[PDB]
Design an enzyme around this catalytic site. Sequence first.
Site, PDB file in Angstrom:
ATOM      1  CD1 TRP A   1      -4.930  -2.476  -9.541  1.00 14.91           C
ATOM      2  CD2 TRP A   1      -4.606  -0.270  -9.798  1.00 14.91           C
ATOM      3  NE1 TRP A   1      -5.568  -1.839  -8.501  1.00 14.91           N
ATOM      4  CE2 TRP A   1      -5.389  -0.486  -8.636  1.00 14.91           C
ATOM      5  CE3 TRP A   1      -4.282   1.048 -10.160  1.00 14.91           C
ATOM      6  CZ2 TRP A   1      -5.856   0.566  -7.840  1.00 14.91           C
ATOM      7  CZ3 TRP A   1      -4.747   2.094  -9.366  1.00 14.91           C
ATOM      8  CH2 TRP A   1      -5.522   1.845  -8.217  1.00 14.91           C
TER       9      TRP A   1
ATOM     10  CG  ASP B   1      -1.845  -3.244  -5.939  1.00 15.48           C
ATOM     11  OD1 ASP B   1      -2.777  -3.482  -5.143  1.00 15.48           O
ATOM     12  OD2 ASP B   1      -0.641  -3.418  -5.656  1.00 15.48           O
TER      13      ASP B   1
ATOM     14  CB  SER C   1     -15.642  -8.094   0.912  1.00 20.31           C
ATOM     15  OG  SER C   1     -14.432  -8.815   0.829  1.00 20.31           O
TER      16      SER C   1
ATOM     17  CG  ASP D   1      -1.872  -1.158   1.272  1.00 23.26           C
ATOM     18  OD1 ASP D   1      -2.232  -1.704   0.206  1.00 23.26           O
ATOM     19  OD2 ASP D   1      -2.266  -1.530   2.396  1.00 23.26           O
TER      20      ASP D   1
ATOM     21  N   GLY E   1      -8.746 -11.344   6.895  1.00 26.38           N
ATOM     22  CA  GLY E   1     -10.131 -11.456   6.415  1.00 26.38           C
ATOM     23  C   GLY E   1     -10.405 -10.944   5.011  1.00 26.38           C
TER      24      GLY E   1
ATOM     25  CB  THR F   1     -12.422 -12.374  -0.148  1.00 29.77           C
ATOM     26  OG1 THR F   1     -12.759 -13.525  -0.934  1.00 29.77           O
ATOM     27  CG2 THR F   1     -13.162 -11.153  -0.688  1.00 29.77           C
TER      28      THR F   1
ATOM     29  NE  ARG G   1      -9.717  -1.000  -7.553  1.00 30.45           N
ATOM     30  CZ  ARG G   1     -10.944  -1.310  -7.142  1.00 30.45           C
ATOM     31  NH1 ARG G   1     -12.011  -0.843  -7.777  1.00 30.45           N
ATOM     32  NH2 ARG G   1     -11.103  -2.099  -6.089  1.00 30.45           N
TER      33      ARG G   1
ATOM     34  CB  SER H   1     -14.014  -5.804  -1.887  1.00 29.92           C
ATOM     35  OG  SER H   1     -13.895  -7.211  -1.744  1.00 29.92           O
TER      36      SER H   1
END
Length: 376
Positions: free
Chosen positions: A229, A153, A346, A114, A211, A213, A225, A343
């Site tokens: 990227w 990404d 999710s 990130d 958690g 996915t 997306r 997401s």
Amino acid sequence: MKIKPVKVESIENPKRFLNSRLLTKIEVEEAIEKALKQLYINIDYFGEEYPTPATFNNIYKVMDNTEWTNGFWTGCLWLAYEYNQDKKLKNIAHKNVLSFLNRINNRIALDHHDLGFLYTPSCTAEYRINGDVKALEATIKAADKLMERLIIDCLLNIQLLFFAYEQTGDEKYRQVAVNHFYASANNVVRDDSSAFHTFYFDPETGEPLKGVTRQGYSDESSWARGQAWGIYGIPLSYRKMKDYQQIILFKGMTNYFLNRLPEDKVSYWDLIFTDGSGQPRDTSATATAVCGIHEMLKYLPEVDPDKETYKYAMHTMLRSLIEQYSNNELIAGRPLLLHGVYSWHSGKGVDEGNIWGDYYYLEALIRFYKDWELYW
């Protein structure tokens, strides 16, 4: 040094782009004005804090500096500042920069995937703008965190390393960036030019990492997306590497994207879906692709038979985002851009505004409007 061969689809029905009207100064100016009105409203809503990654019923919630998305809010502020030179924006955005420097100093909620997304549109952005030494300090420290250390990404994430190389002269930053580009390109894009998207399991035990996915509809699908990227990450990397192979790879990935756009030229959240599917769009993917196309066209030779098609294609997509997808309700917490998907699996930010979508939409506008010096 070699990129694996991919199928480059020819652009189908190119007149669906070539017959569009180019976006005028007045059109882009008014789109920027409308975005900035929402931004100024949101300044009083977020204060010194940040939007959540996505909206909830098209209203952002307010959060601290602990997500992967916080840099995109600061990025919106800097982009607005590029347009109107309002020191108010500089003031608030620099305060975000100080919060990012605090975040890197204390290692608060940092995932190495990130770091580019967090520190480029915030800290590197300010350095580009006014040379702020604390902004540089935060960016280099983030670059160092990335160095201690495959998804598509990462093509955006490595821009942080190229910047670090340029500022320090240390070839190790560049070495890792270059290695990581080829590792990502050869492993995360399929031979048909679609981005690979998988539920990731441990390569030694087969344990999943929750958690979180998977992204993309399925193993056989083409997450929009993820495709974007690639469309943006390749030309960004090309600036720094100048491998002609990268242009071919861009053409493959872009043409694939363009061929799977629906009637209004705004991508569904996964490219296996088109008109009639009843599936939500992901405007954020389309905003990102416009930026990537715009970037590549700075370098793409005049003799490329598809250069003009790409020019008209990005105009077509951006026009559609402006006219059909940009926010018209000037209420506190509203996004700049509607109908993204965060997401799908999710159930997070499905058919909602999101902050990276807002950022890349505004980046596209600024790209079109001025000669913009890249944060990336």
